Amino acid sequence: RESLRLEVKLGQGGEVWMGTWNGTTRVAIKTLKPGLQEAQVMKKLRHEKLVQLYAVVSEEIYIVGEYMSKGSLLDFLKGEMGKYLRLPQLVDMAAQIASGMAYVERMNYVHRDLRAANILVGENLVCKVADFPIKWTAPEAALYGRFTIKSDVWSFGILLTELTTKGRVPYPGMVNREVLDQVERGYRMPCPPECPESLHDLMCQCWRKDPEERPTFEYLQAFLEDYFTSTEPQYQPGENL
Numbered sequence: 001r002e003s004l005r006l007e008v009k010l011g012q013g014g015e016v017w018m019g020t021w022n023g024t025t026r027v028a029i030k031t032l033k034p035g036l037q038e039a040q041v042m043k044k045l046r047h048e049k050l051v052q053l054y055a056v057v058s059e060e061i062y063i064v065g066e067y068m069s070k071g072s073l074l075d076f077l078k079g080e081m082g083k084y085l086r087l088p089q090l091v092d093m094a095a096q097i098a099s100g101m102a103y104v105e106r107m108n109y110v111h112r113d114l115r116a117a118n119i120l121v122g123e124n125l126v127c128k129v130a131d132f133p134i135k136w137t138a139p140e141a142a143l144y145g146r147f148t149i150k151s152d153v154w155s156f157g158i159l160l161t162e163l164t165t166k167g168r169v170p171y172p173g174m175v176n177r178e179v180l181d182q183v184e185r186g187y188r189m190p191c192p193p194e195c196p197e198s199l200h201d202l203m204c205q206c207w208r209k210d211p212e213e214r215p216t217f218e219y220l221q222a223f224l225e226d227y228f229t230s231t232e233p234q235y236q237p238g239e240n241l
């Protein structure tokens with residue numbers, strides 16, 4: 001429609017801007033440098049924990065969508081807020097992402113790149129899935145291209161380590177190659193400092209060798225929503241978590 005007004009340049013890769021749709025609705029605008037399938041997907045998928053597609057400009061997109069004021073989750077955890085987040089806030093954020101992926105799961109879709117960098121945050125610690133990497137990719141997916149919702153579950157397990165480490169890169173010290181050789185031999189990341197074994201157990205369930213044995217995003221959602229009542233009712237704050 002071309003009723004957009006770009007104000008602040010958010011990031012650069014294409015680019016992303018904070019603008020205003022027809023002089024009112026504040027929106028985010030992703031731009032392509034000539035040298036989009038995401039929009040096609042966001043037409044079918046509509047959920048409160050998924051970033052909302054608003055409009056498109058197929059000439060010169062300019063993909064317009066819901067503006068998330070706190071940028072990516074990766075930047076959020078590595079930012080000034082990281083030091084104040086505790087398990088309750090982190091688990092909560094995990095539950096919201098499981099809710100979005102639960103919807104994806106029911107819609108028979110696959111993300112193929114779930115991770116903190118592709119999660120957006122807003123006010124009141126609202127998290128939503130967006131953007132519809134060996135360290136984040138399930139073995140069967142990275143090796144044989146077996147991309148399913150179960151390979152997204154594996155990726156969610158890695159995302160859990162990102163939350164509990166507050167942004168740190170998975171498999172610290174290991175390069176892609178070592179990560180492939182190691183994970184194939186049954187290696188799995190240890191329990192993060194001050195992270196309850198119960199949560200690390202959830203990760204390991206997401207990392208099971210057999211895809212069909214990994215839990216559903218429905219199970220993950222429910223588990224995380226009830227965490228501090230059914231699982232760790234005796235939880236006590238710590239230095240970092």
Ligand SMILES: Cc1cccc(Cc2nn(C(C)(C)C)c3ncnc(N)c23)c1
Binds near residue numbers: 010011053064069072
């Ligand atoms: C649909 C759509 C449109 C524009 C941008 C995105 C992804 C996105 N990316 N970014 C970054 C963090 C600037 C890269 C966003 N910041 C705020 N709101 C957003 N929606 C984003 C998605």
